[PDB]
Amino acid sequence: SQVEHPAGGYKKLFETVEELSSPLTAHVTGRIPLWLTGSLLRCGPGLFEVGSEPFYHLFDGQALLHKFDFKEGHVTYHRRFIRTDAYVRAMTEKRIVITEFGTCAFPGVEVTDNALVNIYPVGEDYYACTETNFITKVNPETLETIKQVDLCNYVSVNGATAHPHIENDGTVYNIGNCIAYNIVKIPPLQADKEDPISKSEIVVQFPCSDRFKPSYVHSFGLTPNYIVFVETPVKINLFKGANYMDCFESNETMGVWLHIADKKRKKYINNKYRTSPFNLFHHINTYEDHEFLIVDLCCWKGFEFVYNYLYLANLRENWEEVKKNARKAPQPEVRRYVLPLNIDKADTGKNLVTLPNTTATAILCSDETIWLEPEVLFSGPRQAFEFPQINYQKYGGKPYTYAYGLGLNHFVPDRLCKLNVKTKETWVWQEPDSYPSEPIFVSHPDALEEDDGVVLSVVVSPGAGQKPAYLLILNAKDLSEVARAEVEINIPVTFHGLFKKS
Amino acid sequence: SQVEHPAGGYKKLFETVEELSSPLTAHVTGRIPLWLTGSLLRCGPGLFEVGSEPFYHLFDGQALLHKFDFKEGHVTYHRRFIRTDAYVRAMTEKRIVITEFGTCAFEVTDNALVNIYPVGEDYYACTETNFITKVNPETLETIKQVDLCNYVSVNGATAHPHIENDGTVYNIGNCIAYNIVKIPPLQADKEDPISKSEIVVQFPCSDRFKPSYVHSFGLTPNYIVFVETPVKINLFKGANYMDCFESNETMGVWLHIADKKRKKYINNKYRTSPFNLFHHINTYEDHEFLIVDLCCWKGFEFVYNYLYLANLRENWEEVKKNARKAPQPEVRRYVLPLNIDKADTGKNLVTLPNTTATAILCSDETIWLEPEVLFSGPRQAFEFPQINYQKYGGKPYTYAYGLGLNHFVPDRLCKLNVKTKETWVWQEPDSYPSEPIFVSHPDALEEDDGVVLSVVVSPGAGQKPAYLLILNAKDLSEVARAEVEINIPVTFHGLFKKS
C-alpha cells in the first residue's frame, strides 16, 4: 500500500549547502567493489536563495557539481558551485542578477547558464549543462569551472537538451529549438586535436506542428539508423517581469506527434505518427526490431505541464499537503510505442504492428496518419518510474531487457526501481526516511549479462541519530545493497550525471 | 512463451453435432461439490451447414441449447436445437431460408445461438435481433418466439441484459438513438412481465444515420454506462448483416452515462482513443466516479472480420498469421468523473488514490480518458468475462474470470485480481475451454468462495472428446470433470440455474 513520509525529511533535498575546499573521506559500510575505479559526477541545485531573495522553482537553484571518487574500496566526496555568469554575478551583487526558469531577476535578454541539470563528455572535455545555448566546461578532477561556451557561436540552435546521446566513438548527438527542431552532431576528437565543438553541424531538421510555437523538448531517441523525436502538447509561446515558466502553454487538441529521421541519409521521414496527449521528459531506450522502432518512454498522462507541480514552496510542504497537491497532476506511466517503418496503403484501417511479443498497435488511417496505442510496462498511482538509466554503453540504441529508475511518490523520490521491459517484473530498494537520486549503472569489467554490475545513487537520510546523506551501491541483478559511503553533511537534490572510469 | 496447437483440435468447436433424445450420464473424475445443485445452461452454434449449403461466419450456425445437471455429485448432459423460424424452415425446405449474420439466403433471423437469461419465471434464448425464444430449462423444448417490437420501440436488443436481484431486466438496443429497455419482475397479477416493458432512458447517436454496434453495457445502482465505439452499422446498406458494418476512423470512442433512478441522460462528453468493445466486465461507483472495467480490442477495424469459420478452421500456423494485423486485446479500467468543475479545465479530474486512469477536462468541455491497463498479452485475450454477479454486479469488486483467446482460439481459463493485477491460469494441451461461469458456495461471505464451470473440447486420440470442468474459484485448481463420449461445439454464453 501507500508509503508515507510524515517526518518530511525530503525537505533537505531543497535546502542550501556550502561547497567543500577539498574532498572528504566517506565512512564505508559493506564492501565497495574493488573493480569500481573512477568518479560519479552529478549536477543539481545547491543554493536556493541569494540572501533574502528566494528562488521559486526546482530548476532555479545555482548549479552544484558533486563527485564521489572510488579507488581500492575507499570513497571520497567533493562538491563545488559552478562559476557560471548566474552564480558569479549573484555573489558579486549579493542578489539574483540573471532570470532563472521560474524566478524573474529585478534591477538585453541575458539567458541563464545555470548548468544544474547534467554533465557529459565532448572529446577530452566535460560540460555541465541546462537546456539553453550556454554549456559550462568543468574540470572533472578538481570540479573547477574552466569556460562558458555559447552553442549559437557554432550551430543554428536557440538551445540544446541536457540529454545528448553519446556513441561509443565519442560522437555527440543533441536536439534544440530553432520554427523547427535541429539535430546537432559534435564529432569525436581527431588527430588535429582541435575543439570538436568548432566542427559542430546540423545533420537533420524536424518540422514543427505550430508555425510560431515549438514544443518543449527534454530528450530524444537514437538507434544505429534512426533518430526519434516526440513532439508533445507542451508548447513555448514565443509571443510571450516574466520568467521561462510564464512562456509555457498546453495545446489541448494536437495530442502527441512522433517523428523519425534516417540518421545515416540525414533525411526526415514523412510518417505522420499520432497518439493521445502526454508529457515526456525521459526516453528510456530506442531500438530497431525488423521493420519497426521500439520506443520506450517515461510518460505523464495529460497535456498539463508537470513542471507546474515542481515549485519549491510545494515540494517543501508537509506530506499530507504534498499528496493533496499531486491529486489532479498527470499520472506517470512507462509506455512502449512501436513505430512501423514500412507503411503499405493495402493495410489502411488495420494494425501494422505484426511483431509477436507486443500489444502496441499502429493503425494506418485514410488521411495517412498512423494512430499509436502503447504497451504499458509500468503503472503505479502517482508512483513514477523516472530518471531512467540502462547499460547505455553496450545496450543504448539496441535490443535490451533492463531499465533502472528513481521512484517518485507524489513527485518525492523515495525508492530505486529495476524494470524487466520484456516480462514487466520489477525490483525495488526502499528504506524509511531515505530519499535517493537517479540510479547510474556501472558494468562489471568481465560482465557476460546485461545487468552484471552495480547502480550508484546519492541518498538523503536526515533522521536524527543517522548520517545525513550517503552514496548507495546496489547489485544491478536484484537491487540488493552492496555498500554505502556515508558523509556527515547534507547533499541537496541532483538530477543527472555519469560514472567516469579511471 | 507462445502455447502452440499444431494438432488443430480447435476445429471440433466448429463441427456440426446431432442433438440428444434424452440426457446422458457423464463419467465423474475428482469430486463434484455436493452443494452444487442446478443446471448449467449454455447457447452456441450446433449446425454449421444445411445439406451442401454452408454457413460462413462463427455467429451463423443454428442455435443449440446445452444443459449440464448437477445433483448429489452426479452429472447429466443434454442438448436440443432451438426450434426457431430459421431452424424449422431450414429443416422443412432442406436449405438456408433465413439470412444469418454472415450468410445470405437465396425476414430478420431469430437464431438464438448467443445467450439465455431469465424474465419473471421464464427463460429466453437470444441473439441480438428483435426476436427472443422462450425455452423450457428442464426439457430444453422450444416454447414460443417473442418479437420485442410488439412491446417496445427498439430494432433489436443485446444478448447481455443486466438482471437486478429482484428480477428486473435492463437491456439496450438501436432505435437514430439507443433505448434502455426495462422489464419488471413478475408481480402478484402473474401476467407476462414483457407486456409491461418500457423505455426508461435514451442515449444520443454520434452519427445521425449510422448507429454504433452495441454488444453490452454497464449498470450500477444509480447509473447506466453506454460505450459508443467506431464500429458503425451503415443503414443505407444478396447482402448479409456483416456487409452493413463500417469503421469510423476519426470519432474514436464516446462514453455515455445516464441517471438510472431519475431516468435522464447526463450531457458529459467522455472521449478516448478507438477500440472494439464486446464485454463490459463490471461497473461500480467510487465517490463521485464510475469505475468502468472493459475487455477492449485496440483499433477501429471490426474484430468480427477475423471470425469467419474458414479462418477459424485453418491449420495453427495460418490461424496465427491471420491474427497478425488484428486489433490487440487489452483489459482496461476507465474512470468517469461525475462532478465536472470548470475551474479544473486542462487538469486530470481523477483524484482517486488507487488508479492511474485519468480524465482531462478540455476547453470544448470534452473529457479525454486514459485507461489503467489491468491485463495485456500479445494476441492473448482475457475475454467472455464473468464475476460473482449476484453479489458484486454493479458494486466494488476484486475478481474477474475469463476465457483466454490465443489468436482468437480459446485455450485456457484465467482469473484476474483487478486491484493487484495478479492472474491465475488453468490450461491443458489440446484442450479448448468455454466461458467460465462462477457459482458461489451458498453460505459464502468472500467474493471468490465457490467454483467456475467450463465446457472443454479435448479431441486428442485415446481421450474423451469433451467434458464439464469444475475449478476452485480461489486458485483455478481442478476440483472435478464430468466426461462425455460425444463432441460439444463452441458455446458463447449461459447461466447456472440453482435448484
Ligand SMILES: CCCC(CCC)COc1cc([C@H](O)CCN)ccc1F
Ligand atoms: C521558455 C522555455 C525555454 C526552454 C528551452 C530554451 C531554449 C527551457 O529553458 C530552460 C530550461 C531550464 C531547465 O533545465 C529545465 C529543467 N530541466 C532552465 C532554464 C531554461 F531557460
Ligand SMILES: CCCC(CCC)COc1cc([C@H](O)CCN)ccc1F
Ligand atoms: C447489421 C447489424 C445488425 C445487429 C442488430 C441491430 C438491430 C446485429 O444483429 C445480429 C447479431 C448476430 C450475433 O448475435 C452477433 C454475435 N453476438 C447475429 C445476427 C444478427 F442479425
Ligand SMILES: CCCCCCCCCCCCCCCC(=O)O
Ligand atoms: C530529482 C527530482 C525530484 C523532485 C521532483 C521530481 C520531478 C521529476 C519529473 C520528471 C522529470 C522532469 C525533469 C526533472 C529533472 C530533469 O530531467 O532535468
Ligand SMILES: CCCCCCCCCCCCCCCC(=O)O
Ligand atoms: C468462444 C469463441 C472462440 C472463437 C472466437 C471467439 C472470439 C471472440 C472475440 C470477442 C467476443 C466477440 C463475441 C463472441 C461471442 C459473443 O459474445 O457473441
Ligand SMILES: [Fe+2]
Ligand atoms: Fe532529465
Ligand SMILES: [Fe+2]
Ligand atoms: Fe457476448
